[PDB]
Amino acid sequence: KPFKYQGLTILVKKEIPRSTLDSFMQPFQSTLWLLVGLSVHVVAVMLYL
Amino acid sequence: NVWNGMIGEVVYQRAVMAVGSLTINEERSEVVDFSVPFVETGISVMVSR
Ligand SMILES: Cc1nc2nc(C3CC3)nn2c(O)c1NS(=O)(=O)c1ccc(C2CCCCC2)cc1
Numbered sequence: 001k002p003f004k005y006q007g008l009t010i011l012v013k014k015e016i017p018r019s020t021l022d023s024f025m026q027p028f029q030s031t032l033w034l035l036v037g038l039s040v041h042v043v044a045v046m047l048y049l
Numbered sequence: 050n051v052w053n054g055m056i057g058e059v060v061y062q063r064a065v066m067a068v069g070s071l072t073i074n075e076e077r078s079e080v081v082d083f084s085v086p087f088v089e090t091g092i093s094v095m096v097s098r
């Protein structure tokens with residue numbers, strides 16, 4: 001009689017996540033970052049204009 | 050010293066086999082011959098969540 005009940009299963013490598021340094025800039029594409037940076041300053045100069 | 054139920058029917062030659070929710074036990078295996086366990090059924094505790 002069985003002394004241990006079990007079954008077949010799959011073992012795989014658990015991917016350890018890697019944290020890139022640009023992770024927080026990742027949500028916005030670099031062109032969006034450049035555009036928002038330019039927008040901040042054009043609005044800033046036009047306020048005082 | 051008298052077996053009732055399905056085990057009683059099997060041991061007293063009133064039946065050839067006992068198909069059902071029959072748990073393999075030490076005493077029952079001493080009295081009757083069991084097939085291989087086709088589903089794992091231990092004893093477990095159910096509680097209200
Ligand atoms: C391809 C790659 N592989 C990496 N492996 C690592 C790890 C764990 C050690 N980081 N990392 C990366 O960051 C990249 N990408 S990068 O070279 O284009 C890049 C570099 C630096 C910055 C800034 C982020 C703000 C602080 C100042 C530096 C941004 C982007």
Ligand SMILES: CCCCCCC
Pocket residue numbers: 033036037
């Ligand atoms: C959330 C604001 C980010 C400004 C980035 C300017 C390059």
